[PDB]
Every structure is written in C-alpha cells, then in structure tokens.
C-alpha cells in the first residue's frame, strides 16, 4: 500500500487569551491520520499555561501518537504559528526523527513565551485566535 508519509495539520484555537486552563492542563486537538491505510493516529496537546513549573512562563506544545499498527513509528516534526497572512513564524523543529511508541508524545515544553504571545503588538493572535501548524515526516 502507498502511504501518506508527510502531512501538515493546522489548528486554530479561538479566544486564546480567554483560555482558562491552569498550569498542567491540556487542550487536545482532533485526531488526524497518516500512514498505511490511515493506521497512524495523531493529535496535538497544548498547555496554554505550561506543562509544569519549569515551563510556567510558556506555552508547551506536543505531538502525540495516539495509535499505530505495530509498536512504534519514528517521525520528524516542526511546530510553528501562523500570522494573520497565514505565514509561518516562531518555528521549532525536531531536527532528527523521534521514536513514538503508541501513546507517547514529543514536543517543546518551552515553545513560546506567554507574555510575548499575548502581546497584541506581535501579531500572533489575530482576532484573538492562535493558529498552530504542525508538519510531520514519518521515517520509512
């Protein structure tokens, strides 16, 4: 079977400044698929107020492998924010592929400073909307 081997997931969180999540709490995206017969299932998990105390000043952002047909897959990934014109900003990338076993995440605990993100001058929350962009490439 042919496979979707690279994919870009776009997710807009409305009223981002209004997120009531406390530190440690998560917003989980819808599940998206890739690979042999949509058999790789993924989602994003974001902590608007950081994963933990170390990251209390940041938004934390992770890619989760929800399920896979075998034990694992290896994948490279990149996260960025889209500005009002749909252009990528503040990208962070994994560089190498990471081992995703079923149920495991990988990402950036200190993806972006909350104060920087929330400041209207920086144009990262047009209409108070956060648009995240996740590009994934799965090792074959």
């Amino acid at each position: 079977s042919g496979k979707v081997v690279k994919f870009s997931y776009m997710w807009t969180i409305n009223n981002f400044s209004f997120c009531r999540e406390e530190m440690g709490e998560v917003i989980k995206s819808s599940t998206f698929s890739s690979g042999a017969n949509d058999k790789l299932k993924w989602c994003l998990r974001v902590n608007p107020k950081g994963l933990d105390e170390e990251s209390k000043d940041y938004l934390s952002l992770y890619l989760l492998l929800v399920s896979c047909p075998k034990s694992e897959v290896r994948a490279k990934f990149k996260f960025s924010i889209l500005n009002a014109k749909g252009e990528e900003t503040k990208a962070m990338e994994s560089q190498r592929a990471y081992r995703f076993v079923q149920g495991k995440d990988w990402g950036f605990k200190k993806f972006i400073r909350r104060d920087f993100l929330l400041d209207e001058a920086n144009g990262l929350l047009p209409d108070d909307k956060l648009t995240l962009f996740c590009e994934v490439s799965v090792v074959q």
Binding site: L51, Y62, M92, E93, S94, Q95, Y98, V101, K104, D105, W106, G107, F108, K109, K110
Partner: peptide
Amino acid sequence: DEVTSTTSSS
C-alpha cells in the same frame, strides 16, 4: 532542539 516528552520509559 530542546525536544522532550511528557513521559519516559526504559
């Protein structure tokens, strides 16, 4: 660059 996971396992 600064990639971590919320869990770890041996």
